[model samples]
Target: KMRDRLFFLLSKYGIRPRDSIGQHFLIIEDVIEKAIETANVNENDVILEVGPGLGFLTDELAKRAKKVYTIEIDQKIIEILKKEYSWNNVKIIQGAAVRVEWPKFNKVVSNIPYKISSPFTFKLLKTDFERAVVMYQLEFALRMVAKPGSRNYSRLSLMAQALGNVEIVMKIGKGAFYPRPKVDSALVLIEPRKDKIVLNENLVKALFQHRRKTVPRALKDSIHMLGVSKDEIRGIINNVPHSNKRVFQLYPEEVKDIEEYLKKHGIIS
Candidate 1:
């Protein structure tokens, strides 16, 4: 079992998993295979991986990818990967994955730190990639694939679908990790949308910050986000699409329409 190997590696390195860093090494072999299969990794593929804890997934990824560019934060682990691991194609970059500039890659496969889920996901969607298979908490995964009017729907659901096509491919037990997490996780597959649509991020955030309020009311309440005067906002929202609907009930395109209308009025650039 991968569990035995995890124990062996920890003991061999005289390392203790750090709770502060959210280092929960995946102990399930199946998930690794699933991630690779879902990504359709090939010798022609240059893959980017994040948080390659203990180098289990790293080693496997190096075997199939043309080059495996992995970003890791933990210095101890990075040293271990550099000195201990045998690899010709894997390039280990030592830094916080979210803050670092990632190399050009066609696909991404990772079991990332849970805390960086929101920032990391949105960052990846903006980058040029064919697809990504990544692990995230089930709750977060649901929000990523959530629909309008659903309880989980919010800014995450809105922007995630706006940027990419998200799907929860599989659920994983907490026991799959060495330092087990409190919650179950799921593998999420994301394919970036090819068509570019102009949307104002600030407007969307301001709207969802007061999701219970109607679009006009929500924008009015958070008018500072638009950096416009109260009178200007009233005039803008008066012609906004779905002006009477609650922010949560407004669809993605409806929000786009509102942004388009605002753009037409020169409310937002």
Candidate 2:
């Protein structure tokens, strides 16, 4: 089993899994195979893999893709990978994923470290990609695929829909990891829309800060940091259609519409 080899490696390296960082090493072979298949790997494809902890998935990717570039955060694990793994096809980068400048890759397949999910997702959305098959914590996956009027809908729902189409590929059991996660993991496939929304992420974040509040109520509290007074913001909200509606209830495009209005007012650039 994966746990035995994983523990053997961990003991040899003196690397203790950090719960604070959500270091739940994936333990299932089937799940790993599913993640790769879902990526639709073609021989010519260059793939970017995030958090190739024990290189189980990396091994499979190298055989299939033209080349695989993996980003890992721990220098200790990076050292272990360099010593134990024999590979010319995989280039392992040691850096926080959120800060690393990703190289060119047509596809992405990763069991992304949960700590970097939000920031890393924002980075991926900004880049052009053929497709990505990524594992996210279950609730986070639900939020990404949620539609307006669903209780699961929130800022993540709006941002993902604005940039691409998200589909749930599989549900992963908590037992799939060595340090089993409290919540289940899920595989989600994201294919970017050709016509993605043009707006600032901070604006989207601000707009949904008061997700439950009506726009008149929410925008008033959230826009103060963007150089707009409460009065001006409230005025703009009132003039905009659906000012009485709550942000979580607004469609993704509707949220973009409001963002456009705010952009026009020089409130958000």
Candidate 3:
């Protein structure tokens, strides 16, 4: 029912969804319902919906939230959204969502394109927000929630854990979309930490890029990549027991501790 409805809408406008953006139009009503339900939308909340391709999710958001601000990269889609969508509370903007400064929103919900996952999320975490319900490729989502020693653990996992608690809301197959994606996707709920810890994203990136290397060697890589001195970097983690272990062996909080150690030594500003 919903699949034909989505196709008919696009067909009426002579629009065909493209894959250059690394996404397909989500058509399965059940999956869409799960995403909205997990979001726990309310009347008082202002919701930011990214990549609202055909306004289905935005319509649902408009029905619940105080206001629905949608960002779409496609010019044609934005125009179509404006002409076709009658929801008074729904605002549509045509732009790369990753590049735009998010307006005030209490909650964010997006089935973001895979290409912008890393940078988009980096911005999302840094910005002040109460919560986010987002969708990602299954592999990407796994890395976001990976444990310290898991094979999926990476800089993403470290940074994600640093900023908030990630909970898997639901996992759905590729059939959820009109043109099936090669890989399945997952919905993740991110609750921003109230009492947050400041960690170096650059240092974390440098360290985790060579995650297989021993901790000392990894720190050396970070020093070389970040223009920091070897002696100053080594001096920070010198007395640490886990300093000699491999990068992936260390817990996410260990990086926080290391960041503080560098700050205390004035090696970082």
Candidate 4:
């Protein structure tokens, strides 16, 4: 039923899911319900829905939340949505969500395009939203909530932890979508922090980029990359443990310790 409805909507507008845009519409009603329930959105909450293709989830959001602000990069889809639901409380904006000034909303609920997932997630993290319920590719979702010392952990994991707490509330199989995707999907709930945690993000990125190198060696390499002298690098290395160990071997707090060690020794600003 859901798949047919989605197909009909797409056919009506002469729109086909394009691979260039990484477009795959969610066709499972149960997954949509689970996504909304996981968000814990209230009637008073204003929701920001990204890439609300064919109003699949937008209609549901409008029924539950006070207002649903949707952003669509595709001009054709925006026109179709506006003409279809003219009087609905869905404010459809024809622009990229990353470049626009996303209004202050309490909650964000969307099945974002896979291509823009990383940038879109970072943009939301920089906002003041209370919570977000988003659908991301399965691997991306795992990386988002990955902890230190895990193989899935990377620079993105550190940034996510530093900015907010991420929880994988539910996972959806490939069958849940219209043009079934090759990879599975997961719904993540991000609770943004009111106060930013103090951490050297640049140091983290540099270290993780060469995860195989020891902490001291990685720091020295990064210092060199920054065009610092060998003497300065040695001094910085002396301050931190130079023993051969991978970056992922350290815990999140230990990573922070390394960052502080670098900053104190004038290795990194």
For lDDT, the strongest prediction is 1
Q: State the lDDT of candidate 4 residue by residue for 107-204, as single tens digits.
A: 99998777888988877766778788999999899988987768877777777777788899888898887678879999898886666565676677
Model 4 regions lying over 4 Å from their true place: 193-196, 224-229, 241-245
Return the lDDT, model 1, position 24: 80
Root-mean-square deviation per candidate: 1.9, 2.7, 2.3, 2.4
Model 4 residue 210 lDDT score: 85
User: What's the candidate order when arranged by decreasing lDDT?
Assistant: 1, 2, 3, 4
Which number leads on TM-score?
1
Clashes of each: 0, 0, 0, 0
My TM-score estimates for the predictions, one after another, are 0.93, 0.87, 0.91, 0.89
Cα lDDT for residue 156, model 2?
A: 73
Model 1, residue 149: what's the lDDT?
Answer: 84
Give lDDT per model, in order: 0.83, 0.82, 0.80, 0.78
Off by over 4 Å in 2: 1-10, 223-236, 261-269
Candidate 2 matches the true fold with a TM-score of 0.87
Candidate 1 at 128: error in angstroms? 0.8
Off by over 4 Å in 1: 225-235
For candidate 1, the 10 contiguous residues with the lowest summed lDDT are: 224-233
Residue 78 miss distance in model 3 (angstroms): 0.8
